[PDB]
Design a protein around this nucleic acid. Sequence first.
DNA 1: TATCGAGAATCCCGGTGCCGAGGCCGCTCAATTGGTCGTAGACAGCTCTAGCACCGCTTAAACGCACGTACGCGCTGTCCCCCGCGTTTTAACCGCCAAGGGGATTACTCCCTAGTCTCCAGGCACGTGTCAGATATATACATCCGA
DNA 2: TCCGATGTATATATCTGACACGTGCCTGGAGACTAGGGAGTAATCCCCTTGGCGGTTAAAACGCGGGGGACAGCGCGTACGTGCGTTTAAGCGGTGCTAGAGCTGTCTACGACCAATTGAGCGGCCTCGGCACCGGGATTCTCGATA
Lengths: 97, 97, 8, 8, 83, 83, 98, 96, 110, 110
Amino acid sequence: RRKTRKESYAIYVYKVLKQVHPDTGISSKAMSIMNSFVNDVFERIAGEASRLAHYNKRSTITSREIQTAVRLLLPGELAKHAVSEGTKAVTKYTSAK
Amino acid sequence: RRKTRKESYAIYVYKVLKQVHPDTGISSKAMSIMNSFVNDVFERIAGEASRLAHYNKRSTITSREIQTAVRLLLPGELAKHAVSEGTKAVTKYTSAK
Amino acid sequence: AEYNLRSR
Amino acid sequence: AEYNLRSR
Amino acid sequence: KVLRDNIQGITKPAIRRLARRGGVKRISGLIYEETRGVLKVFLENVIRDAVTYTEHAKRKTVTAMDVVYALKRQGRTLYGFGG
Amino acid sequence: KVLRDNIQGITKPAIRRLARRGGVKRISGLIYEETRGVLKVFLENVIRDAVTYTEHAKRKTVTAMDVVYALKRQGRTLYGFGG
Amino acid sequence: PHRYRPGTVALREIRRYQKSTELLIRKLPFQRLVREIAQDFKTDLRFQSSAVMALQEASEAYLVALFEDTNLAAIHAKRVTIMPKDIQLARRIRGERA
Amino acid sequence: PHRYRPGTVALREIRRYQKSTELLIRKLPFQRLVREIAQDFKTDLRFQSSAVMALQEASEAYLVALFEDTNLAAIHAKRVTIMPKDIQLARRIRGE
Amino acid sequence: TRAKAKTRSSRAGLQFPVGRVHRLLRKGNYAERVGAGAPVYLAAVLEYLTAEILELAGNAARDNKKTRIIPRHLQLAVRNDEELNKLLGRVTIAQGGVLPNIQSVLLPKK
Amino acid sequence: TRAKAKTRSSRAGLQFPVGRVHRLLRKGNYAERVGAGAPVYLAAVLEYLTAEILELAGNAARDNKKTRIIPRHLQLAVRNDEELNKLLGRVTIAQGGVLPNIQSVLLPKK
DNA sequence: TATCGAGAATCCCGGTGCCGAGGCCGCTCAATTGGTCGTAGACAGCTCTAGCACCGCTTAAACGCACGTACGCGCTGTCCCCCGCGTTTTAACCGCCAAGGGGATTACTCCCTAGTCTCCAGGCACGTGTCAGATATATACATCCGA
DNA sequence: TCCGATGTATATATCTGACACGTGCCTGGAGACTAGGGAGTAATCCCCTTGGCGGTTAAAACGCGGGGGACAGCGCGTACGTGCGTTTAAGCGGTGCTAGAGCTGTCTACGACCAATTGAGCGGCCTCGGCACCGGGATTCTCGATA
């Protein structure tokens, strides 16, 4: 019988690659590293957002916990540009209802 | 009105002090450090036990996740002696339940 | 709309 | 009760 | 209103006492400015994160817990102020 | 089957190539034994944790994920093998 | 008149300050440095007294431990005198310095 | 006959190995070292091929980065030659 | 009848999967509850950080005259940027190598 | 009818609070479920590690001719023990000071 | 190359004073008892992946050795820059009074998320074709180093 | 500078196997809807932070003298780099077995949840023993001078 689903970020990493560099490809080793990078940054941000909710006696991780976790974890201009993109996305999503 | 109840490990740290050195006392700054130490080691062990449950596709943190987290976190003979005490406690508890 | 990259 | 300390 | 130039209040004899606790017998005269630059960088990193915890809590007062969390997040856990 | 004294298979020319990637121009002949002792300590720390993850899973095979978790909990996260 | 030789009182001071536990920076000057650094992150911040003491305890522990590593870098270079290049090596090998 | 001067081929080798990405330890010798170290923690362990390769990539990255810090310790002591005391200083200051 | 389904990713204007991020936040034991804007914000940040690495790695590929990103190009992208190098300072990239760097004192005198 | 309450701490033979440790495990977002033996094992380990530090710090107090443990005695206890020093290697003890330690090359000749 | 012995220093003792540690007490909230229900995971059984073992060949790489040179490092000499310490100046520290910002509740309400049920299309495993690039072979061009 | 010998970069042509793509189906994401409790808000108390004042004296700042440590220049010998011929065993591809990783399917023991009960632990009180300090004497490290 066919093998079980292994879930991956690879198709979204490829969609983002096709936007920043439409003629560039990626090796499966480099895609595996990109998948590890996404999983690592997800776990860092969600873990700091988790600590932030607990410190403040809150049951909910919100867009606000994610924003503070991103400000804590990302250095310098990566934080400013990531916070810009996160706020733009939640604004567009809220307007779409 | 009376202040709201802030829990701490201070009475149990003092009970352990009275067993290991019956005539020795402790300052409130040293007790505050002991409370920070207990909280820190609890958070490390429970956090590694939590990763161990997730890595193994398990919903439950058991005595077995705690044992492996202790083996990962504690150096050398601290691990062997902590595992001895943890196993001694669970076997007394499950005899007396 | 494109990404607001530090490079662009 | 006794503690199994590294000192004992 | 605003404060300025307080790093020079970290005195040569204070930096010498810290170096003596560090076991240092002899100190070049260029060390005091190098140490001030290092201290300002260390404090800027801890206070930026501590103030980030204070703002997340919607507080105006930086607590000892904001400092303890900022230090723990930077891998420099402090015992004796809570946490 | 059984194995002994395999640290000698970490050859002088292999250690020289690692030192060259590290930017090293000149190497004392005492470095090769020091580097072997350092590598054995590094591998003992990673493999002890990896085998601890393997035994927790009740497996007999050390996976690349056991190694990646052992490396991650020691502050040496590896990308390109999963996780 | 009586006079100790260079480094004799330095060794006496090392023994005094490694026996003691008090904070070695003056508290009011350090508190003004904390408030000055904080004003660049936001204006009108208050501090708990224990927050300033937590910052001072962490800062002095950090500087003392860096002076130990700096002293090893000086001794490795066949010197008994610490220099800025010993701090710079200690912080580079620690991964603090790029 | 032709000779390059001491350190000319060393600089050529630094340039070559800092350009490339291949593993610099021989794979079979490294794999036997991993199995030898593992047998003290549990008898008759198997390894995924990718587990041994993960251990080798981490080990070589660790040794290369330590040689960079060791080279800085040698240069600080006014030497171009690395010595065991430079590795010892690097590992002590790292807190290893 | 129910209206035609559209992804929360498309409502946000994202390539990264908002529904998968939401399910990972709910199942990952981060908190008791997850807010509706949390997975949108986190998906956008993961997408942005992906775009930052890939832009620099596709530039490194192009500079090396290759059309495919390989682990080397991700290492050159990360280590030549001070902020990605700070973010990934404890991270090893498999088959990444190192930056070309010789200490100035070791170079031959001319 | 209903029997008198006995603490899970005393049922395990512990001073440390098994019921509090259990509630902290359930409320701390560590997993969906917590096993009945998990808080007993964890409480025993926290009690043992408390007893290890307090034994060495009560000895440090006695060697300093004091009857009261102060932050100094916890620091001497931890830094003179190689395994507690490894466990607490990233930890600062407030008001603890440092070990008495002079590099041998700095001492005067004999 | 060891011995006086003036001097500054640290250790040590008995006495004085206070204020923090640690017992005592009463209230309350959170731990325990007892019981139900639902599903996590323990177990048995089976598939078929991929890890282990061995064979034989090729040749890349490790090894061992000879040579010579450039580096490590001990010595010595200069001189500067740091330490020790006596004096003067600064401002920290302390104890105190005082105001009010804002931390830390408490109650009340509603809108946000968890949970359920039912679709249905986004993402996966699989199977496929072709062009990016790893390689051999060639050689133009740059560097090194003896002359 | 300038030549021979060596090494690296750049070109072209082969061929191979990894990437990017297309197809089918299924499981997990979305649509629609409900219950109920988290947290947003308003109102309030009173903690503890900020600010300012005067005395005192610990500590910082300053200047000077001189010695010992930084560091440059030198000599010299040894231990390392380069290059060669020989030996070792890694790497490759190939065949083959079977341990054990991974998955399916059935049960039942375990943990979450609820409702009632009550004693362990907290905050507040308060008092007297350990520790901090005074202030003096005993003893011991330093280091210029004696022999």
